[PDB]
Amino acid sequence: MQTVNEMLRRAATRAPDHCALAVPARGLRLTHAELRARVEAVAARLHADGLRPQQRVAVVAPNSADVVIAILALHRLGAVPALLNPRLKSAELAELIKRGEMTAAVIAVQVADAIFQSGSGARIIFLGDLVRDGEPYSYGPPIEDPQREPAQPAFIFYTSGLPKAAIIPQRAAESRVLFMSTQVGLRHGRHNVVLGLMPLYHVVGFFAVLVAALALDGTYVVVEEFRPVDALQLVQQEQVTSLFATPTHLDALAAAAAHAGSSLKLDSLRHVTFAGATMPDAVLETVHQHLPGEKVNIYGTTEAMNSLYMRQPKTGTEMAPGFFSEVRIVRIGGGVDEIVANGEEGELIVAASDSAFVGYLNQPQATAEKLQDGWYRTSDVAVWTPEGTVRILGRVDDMIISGGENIHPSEIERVLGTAPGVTEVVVIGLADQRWGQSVTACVVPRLGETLSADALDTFCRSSELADFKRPKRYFILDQLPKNALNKVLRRQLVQQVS
Amino acid sequence: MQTVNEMLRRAATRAPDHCALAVPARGLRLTHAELRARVEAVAARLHADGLRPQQRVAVVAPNSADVVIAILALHRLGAVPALLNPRLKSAELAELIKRGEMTAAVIAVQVADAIFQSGSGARIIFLGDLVRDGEPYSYGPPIEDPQREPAQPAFIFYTSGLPKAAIIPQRAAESRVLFMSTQVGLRHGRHNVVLGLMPLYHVVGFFAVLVAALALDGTYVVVEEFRPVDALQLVQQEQVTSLFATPTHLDALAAAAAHAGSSLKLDSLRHVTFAGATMPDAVLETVHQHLPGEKVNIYGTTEAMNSLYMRQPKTGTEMAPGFFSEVRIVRIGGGVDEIVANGEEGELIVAASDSAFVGYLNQPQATAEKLQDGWYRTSDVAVWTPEGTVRILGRVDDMIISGGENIHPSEIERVLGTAPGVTEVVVIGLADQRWGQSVTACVVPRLGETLSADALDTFCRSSELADFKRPKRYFILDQLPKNALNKVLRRQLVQQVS
Numbered sequence: 001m002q003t004v005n006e007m008l009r010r011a012a013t014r015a016p017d018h019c020a021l022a023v024p025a026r027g028l029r030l031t032h033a034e035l036r037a038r039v040e041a042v043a044a045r046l047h048a049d050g051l052r053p054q055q056r057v058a059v060v061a062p063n064s065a066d067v068v069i070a071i072l073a074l075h076r077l078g079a080v081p082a083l084l085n086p087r088l089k090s091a092e093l094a095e096l097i098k099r100g101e102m103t104a105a106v107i108a109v110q111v112a113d114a115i116f117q118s119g120s121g122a123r124i125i126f127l128g129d130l131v132r133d134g135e136p137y138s139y140g141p142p143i144e145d146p147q148r149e150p151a152q153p154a155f156i157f158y159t160s161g162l163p164k165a166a167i168i169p170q171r172a173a174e175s176r177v178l179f180m181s182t183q184v185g186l187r188h189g190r191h192n193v194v195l196g197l198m199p200l201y202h203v204v205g206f207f208a209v210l211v212a213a214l215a216l217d218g219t220y221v222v223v224e225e226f227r228p229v230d231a232l233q234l235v236q237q238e239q240v241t242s243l244f245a246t247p248t249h250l251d252a253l254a255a256a257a258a259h260a261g262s263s264l265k266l267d268s269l270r271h272v273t274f275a276g277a278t279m280p281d282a283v284l285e286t287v288h289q290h291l292p293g294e295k296v297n298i299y300g301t302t303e304a305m306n307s308l309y310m311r312q313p314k315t316g317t318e319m320a321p322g323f324f325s326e327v328r329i330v331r332i333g334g335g336v337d338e339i340v341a342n343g344e345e346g347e348l349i350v351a352a353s354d355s356a357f358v359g360y361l362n363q364p365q366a367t368a369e370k371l372q373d374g375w376y377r378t379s380d381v382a383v384w385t386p387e388g389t390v391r392i393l394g395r396v397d398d399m400i401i402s403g404g405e406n407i408h409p410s411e412i413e414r415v416l417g418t419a420p421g422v423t424e425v426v427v428i429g430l431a432d433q434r435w436g437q438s439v440t441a442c443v444v445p446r447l448g449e450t451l452s453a454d455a456l457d458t459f460c461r462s463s464e465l466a467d468f469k470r471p472k473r474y475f476i477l478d479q480l481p482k483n484a485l486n487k488v489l490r491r492q493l494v495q496q497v498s
Numbered sequence: 499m500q501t502v503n504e505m506l507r508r509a510a511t512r513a514p515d516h517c518a519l520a521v522p523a524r525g526l527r528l529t530h531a532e533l534r535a536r537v538e539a540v541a542a543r544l545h546a547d548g549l550r551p552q553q554r555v556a557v558v559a560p561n562s563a564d565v566v567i568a569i570l571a572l573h574r575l576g577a578v579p580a581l582l583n584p585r586l587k588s589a590e591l592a593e594l595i596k597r598g599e600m601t602a603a604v605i606a607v608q609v610a611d612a613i614f615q616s617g618s619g620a621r622i623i624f625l626g627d628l629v630r631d632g633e634p635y636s637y638g639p640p641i642e643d644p645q646r647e648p649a650q651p652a653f654i655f656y657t658s659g660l661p662k663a664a665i666i667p668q669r670a671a672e673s674r675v676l677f678m679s680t681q682v683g684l685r686h687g688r689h690n691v692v693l694g695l696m697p698l699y700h701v702v703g704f705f706a707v708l709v710a711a712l713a714l715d716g717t718y719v720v721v722e723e724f725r726p727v728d729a730l731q732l733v734q735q736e737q738v739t740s741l742f743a744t745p746t747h748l749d750a751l752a753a754a755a756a757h758a759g760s761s762l763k764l765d766s767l768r769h770v771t772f773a774g775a776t777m778p779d780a781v782l783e784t785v786h787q788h789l790p791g792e793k794v795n796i797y798g799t800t801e802a803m804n805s806l807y808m809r810q811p812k813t814g815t816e817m818a819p820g821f822f823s824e825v826r827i828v829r830i831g832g833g834v835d836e837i838v839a840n841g842e843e844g845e846l847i848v849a850a851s852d853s854a855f856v857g858y859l860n861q862p863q864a865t866a867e868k869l870q871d872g873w874y875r876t877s878d879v880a881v882w883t884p885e886g887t888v889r890i891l892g893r894v895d896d897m898i899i900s901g902g903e904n905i906h907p908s909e910i911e912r913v914l915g916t917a918p919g920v921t922e923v924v925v926i927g928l929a930d931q932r933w934g935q936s937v938t939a940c941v942v943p944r945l946g947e948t949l950s951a952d953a954l955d956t957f958c959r960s961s962e963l964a965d966f967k968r969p970k971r972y973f974i975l976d977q978l979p980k981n982a983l984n985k986v987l988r989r990q991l992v993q994q995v996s
């Protein structure tokens with residue numbers, strides 16, 4: 001097996017003087033050999049300070065060359081980095097560090113004061129004390145390479161109450177990189193220039209983007225702050241060959257690319273990759289229209305990485321398993337062998353092979369729910385189409401059951417999203433008078449526009465929606481309740497309207 | 499890890515009703531599911547007859563759907579197939595089966611009578627008794643899946659006195675397939691139609707061609723006998739997307755493709771792959787001119803599979819390591835850490851990682867010579883170019899040392915191959931009067947043409963060859979001595995001329 005460390009080690013023997021890390025705004029460029037030397041330097045310093053293999057170390061920082069070096073240094077030492085979203089609230093981060101029994105926390109700095117008040121025994125390490133614009137503070141003797149074993153913890157990543165600590169074993173790294181070759185069509189070579197739009201604390205941003213970029217002897221371009229015009233200019237200046245972005249970022253990029261008066265040259269870009277399950281047909285058409293390269297839709301989890309994909313997608317919900325993957329659709333709430341009959345809806349489950357996590361840290365119960373008899377349960381509903389592909393229908397937990405029939409809010413939300421005057425929509429089930437749920441739509445008007453239940457119903461009646469799927473009721477609201485991460489709080493919304 | 503069996507098993511869950519095996523001349527087509535059922539059937543029958551996991555079974559047969567099924571059935575049972583070139587002499591095959599301590603031999607049938615006379619305890623199994631045009635003789639209870647372990651023997655393949663039995667471990671299969679994705683640019687999908695030009699008893703023909711074709715959810719097209727026109731027609735009829743062929747086959751294919759009056763449509767073909775180290779510049783130009791698709795040169799061994807490659811090659815000897823690979827150039831006859839200074843010639847050695855063989859069967863001494871301190875020694879001479887690529891110079895054993903300077907016959911042979919009137923040439927060293935060797939060229943004239951030492955020397959003097967490299971002597975011969983496999987016997991030639 002090639003661990004992350006080993007893939008990078010091998011790449012550096014092959015392409016020592018080729019650019020590995022580029023930070024164009026900062027004018028910082030490091031070769032594969034230069035990066036390896038700085039990783040080794042930081043690792044040695046961390047070891048001298050007391051850090052030992054298989055100890056867990058939290059990382060709380062936005063994307064940057066310094067955090068790339070820190071994460072890889074921790075891994076080189078043999079510590080287990082636990083990458084955390086720095087946009088989370090301080091007390092929430094402190095709780096997770098406490099729950100995780102971390103030896104230390106490497107932070108970009110009032111998070112430290114929060115860790116001190118939690119009672120945690122985690123030693124605070126400021127990122128700025130380790131490495132500054134690629135330059136390490138060097139000390140301590142050279143250190144041994146730790147023994148890495150296939151099933152052993154390598155990295156911890158967090159999911160969407162509190163986020164769960166998914167443990168990624170050493171053996172998972174290779175296939176979490178190589179799917180980008182088998183599915184997406186990346187190949188080895190010094191032509192590879194990868195734009196780092198995805199967060200490093202997301203499995204895609206780390207394995208599929210950063211690690212893939214370097215493992216294939218290419219360049220990772222660091223983007224600290226997202227700006228659509230700045231990103232497209234970087235495509236031209238750095239000759240970016242591939243980008244992985246969110247639907248939100250892609251919509252922004254497509255719009256910035258759409259001007260006739262623009263001098264932008266996007267010719268180098270050959271791959272545009274995304275998780276487009278939630279992507280409306282309209283966003284997908286603008287991506288096809290205004291951005292070059294092959295478009296590939298992927299379906300992925302923190303827990304299992306890549307399970308389905310589609311080249312040149314026409315919609316965001318239709319995909320099929322690729323290399324590495326084995327999938328089934330089973331009776332909702334049933335055992336892993338209870339295969340549905342074709343055309344019937346069930347839960348998508350995916351074989352837990354080398355890419356799969358080994359469990360959630362200190363949560364035995366949640367693990368038992370997700371990993372059963374060699375299979376990872378997605379908690380998503382799906383169906384086999386007449387063409388033998390998988391149609392993702394939505395989350396099991398979002399499903400509305402009205403008169404004993406399954407309705408998926410995501411489908412209704414996509415239709416209603418295109419109705420005149422609608423800027424936002426969330427579809428929920430509210431309790432009816434016959435022990436079921438009634439389909440209910442909460443809608444926000446475009447600025448200055450007037451919505452009415454009658455006009456929205458008139459629009460739904462003209463659509464392809466089956467009768468039983470049309471909302472029975474509308475709530476017209478000035479705004480929807482959202483957390484600090486711009487995610488709709490479905491449960492708080494039910495309470496506000498009901 | 500995915501063993502060969504596991505890669506095929508997973509592919510069949512993904513694409514059960516897609517064509518896996520096509521024999522167009524015979525009108526035979528089998529889906530992934532149909533192939534798996536026949537593999538399972540033959541495996542069960544083999545087990546009932548007494549065959550058990552980790553027992554070695556020789557296979558002596560030309561390419562066909564039946565041998566594909568037999569090999570995969572042996573592997574499914576857990577036996578270790580030892581694939582042998584059926585063009586070898588009977589007593590030579592019998593000797594190798596004896597030396598290998600085989601439990602049995604599956605043969606297309608006077609090889610059987612030879613095995614009986616060798617004294618071997620190998621039970622003879624005729625291929626025609628197991629499966630006929632895809633149809634198995636079925637009996638016996640269903641059998642357990644054997645435990646497969648990473649380091650455990652999986653397949654045996656033979657090299658170029660007697661051929662050596664290279665043991666390929668279970669863990670080697672995945673990277674021996676996936677290099678075709680990282681290096682050559684194949685990707686997962688039902689678009690894959692692979693033409694089976696390479697012999698199944700060659701590691702390329704098995705892992706890189708057959709197993710890759712199926713593992714990626716594609717089709718393997720069986721070719722029992724090579725014919726250039728028939729092969730190109732199959733490209734059109736079956737919509738072949740990739741082919742791997744010898745330089746000899748490629749020259750034949752290019753010529754057949756070169757007619758303006760031809761109706762052939764080769765548009766589906768996107769990848770033409772070859773081991774082109776021995777390929778002259780002229781053959782490479784005709785391939786570029788007359789065949790479509792991306793051309794990729796690979797450097798490979800039975801022992802280590804893929805160690806170097808080049809996309810869109812301009813010559814056959816300049817390549818660089820790809821994904822999986824780590825290479826060094828060391829002092830000839832020295833230790834694995836004795837790196838040469840750049841520009842100096844040495845032996846190419848390659849890291850023995852997952853793809854590597856684990857040793858030669860029953861030959862401890864030959865193993866110790868080839869596998870040292872984590873490295874496989876190629877026995878090829880090479881040099882790092884000013885551009886940081888590897889230039890393959892030829893075999894260590896072929897090198898001529900004249901006045902203390904290294905001369906490589908392959909270089910001289912390529913120049914002399916283009917001289918007026920020359921149809922064949924072999925360059926050898928003969929003992930001089932100062933304890934060294936003199937560069938000597940043995941040449942065969944084109945039919946009816948007259949060669950002379952003077953005209954050949956005149957041609958060499960006009961070439962880019964350094965003074966010290968030009969032949970001091972010519973032997974003009976009506977033919978060169980060759981074995982039954984059309985390979986020049988270098989040692990018999992020295993004796994004939996000296």
Ligand SMILES: [Ca+2]
Nearest residue numbers: 477478479480
């Ligand atoms: Ca309000």
Ligand SMILES: [Ca+2]
Nearest residue numbers: 975976977978
């Ligand atoms: Ca003769």
